[PDB]
Automatic annotation (TrEMBL), chain A:
<protein>
    <submittedName>
        <fullName>CviR transcriptional regulator</fullName>
    </submittedName>
</protein>
<dbReference type="GO" id="GO:0006355">
    <property type="term" value="P:regulation of DNA-templated transcription"/>
</dbReference>
<keyword id="KW-0804">Transcription</keyword>
<dbReference type="Pfam" id="PF00196">
    <property type="entry name" value="GerE"/>
</dbReference>
<dbReference type="InterPro" id="IPR036693">
    <property type="entry name" value="TF_LuxR_autoind-bd_dom_sf"/>
</dbReference>
<keyword id="KW-0805">Transcription regulation</keyword>
<dbReference type="Pfam" id="PF03472">
    <property type="entry name" value="Autoind_bind"/>
</dbReference>
<dbReference type="InterPro" id="IPR036388">
    <property type="entry name" value="WH-like_DNA-bd_sf"/>
</dbReference>
<dbReference type="InterPro" id="IPR000792">
    <property type="entry name" value="Tscrpt_reg_LuxR_C"/>
</dbReference>
<dbReference type="GO" id="GO:0003677">
    <property type="term" value="F:DNA binding"/>
</dbReference>
<dbReference type="InterPro" id="IPR016032">
    <property type="entry name" value="Sig_transdc_resp-reg_C-effctor"/>
</dbReference>
<dbReference type="InterPro" id="IPR005143">
    <property type="entry name" value="TF_LuxR_autoind-bd_dom"/>
</dbReference>
<keyword id="KW-0238">DNA-binding</keyword>
């Protein structure tokens, strides 16, 4: 996870609390759009971008999923697509979840020719330097990037730390609006062996009416049942009949 | 506003961690670090299907681990589920104390359950609620005891935490843009084609096409024609 920043006034702190809180409440796209609007107006810039993207193991982006963009100049867009800078952009090469990255700092250390060429072209349309924050969701190799272009965003150390802890909640909010399909565990086994044993564990039976029933005897029933109760994260078995109440219905 | 200074710190911490909960154990663990800043040791977290009416129809999953071991056995056996005046709350409407909602239940099956609860320590408590009307699914979070409710500062803390536990519960369990004619419009907008080359292909006058182009854009929340193209790229790829 990410550790909160400090050396934030309460306003700064209260504010951030505000953002995270609301973010937990975003569903429809309209919500997400406005929310960012209020964010990018306590922000030394008017050019933002929010994108989902599938991830690899080192948490690089390979393909982009969806973009819920904000302000980027629609000329730099046209050109970004046409020239297919997507490949030569040194920013899509970050490893996600490592927040946050300065455009300037990551532009003086790119040493390819296709890169140094993109970098220069960016520096004309204002994308010379900027900062981007990232969040990743390794359960599913999906990730978020959030960019703001400009030299001024990064000179605001307080606000950088705030946006950086907000990111991972924007990520959650993003996944929610774009209703991506699973992604499935898909679902935790009964499990097979457990269902026969849990199938009946819940109502009207003892370790013995079960072992005999499964031809495993009270003993096998006993060895197998507590794998269940610890599987279902339950201290008590009749507490395991309560938590694992749902499986014997959803299959 | 506010109030206290500290409390915000922990409250903020609770919401931050609850936005990170994926796995089931993560949820388990976290509810412990919550119920140990809590005047009680008997809670419980449950999802349930949400009807148009406030009262729940069926329980989906229970992901708790507090309630005793006897009161459970009995709650099931007697099927108190029906006459429990608590499952009758309407979700998403602040918190409601057990005591306050027990002196105002006036049925006999109810007054009978209420009394049986009062022997097993459930004679008083509190329950916060979160609902998700997009899908009629909702969360309850209970803590049993007279002491939880006498602590105003966290009552309000746990109350604002609830809706984030709700989100965390869903994810732990689950599992539950443009008109088609226009999409053809957009399908072309995206290949470089001008307003004209479209009238061309789908056989519609520019006024007819220049009209659709505007509609798709706002639908997507885009500034211009070349930023609606970008926002919506995920539409013609899936
Ligand atoms: O903001 C970013 C990263 C995201 C750019 O992704 C894309 C990819 C494809 C499309 Cl169509 C649009 C944006 N990069 C800054 C750095 C300099 O110029 C930029 O565009
Ligand atoms: O906390 C609740 C609602 C949740 C009770 O759900 C269940 C259902 C089944 C089981 Cl196994 C356990 C708890 N109800 C309070 C009100 C008085 O006594 C209670 O138990």
């Amino acid at each position: 996870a990410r550790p909160l920043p400090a050396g934030l006034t309460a306003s700064q702190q209260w504010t951030l609390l505000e953002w995270i809180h609301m973010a937990g409440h975003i569903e429809t796209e309209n919500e997400l759009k406005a929310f960012l609007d209020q964010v990018l107006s306590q922000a030394p810039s008017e050019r933002l971008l929010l994108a989902l993207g599938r991830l690899n193991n080192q948490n690089q982006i390979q393909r982009l999923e969806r973009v819920l963009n904000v302000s980027y100049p629609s000329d730099w867009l046209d050109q970004y697509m046409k020239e297919n800078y997507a490949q030569h952009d040194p920013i899509l090469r970050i490893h996600l979840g490592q927040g946050p990255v300065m455009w300037e700092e990551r532009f003086n250390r790119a040493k390819g020719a296709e890169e140094k060429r993109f970098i220069a072209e960016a520096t004309q349309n204002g994308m010379g330097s900027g900062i981007t924050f990232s969040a990743a969701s390794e359960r599913n190799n999906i990730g978020s990037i959030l960019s703001i272009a400009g030299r001024e965003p990064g000179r605001n150390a307080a606000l950088v730390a705030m946006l950086n802890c907000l990111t991972p909640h924007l990520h959650q909010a993003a996944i929610r609006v774009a209703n991506l399909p699973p992604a499935s565990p898909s679902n935790m086994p009964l499990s097979q062996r457990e269902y026969d044993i849990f199938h009946w564990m819940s109502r009207g039976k003892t370790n013995w009416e079960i072992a005999t029933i499964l031809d495993i005897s009270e003993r096998t029933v006993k060895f197998h049942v507590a794998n269940v109760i610890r599987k279902l994260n339950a201290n008590n078995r009749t507490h395991a009949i309560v938590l694992g109440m749902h499986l014997a219905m959803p299959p």
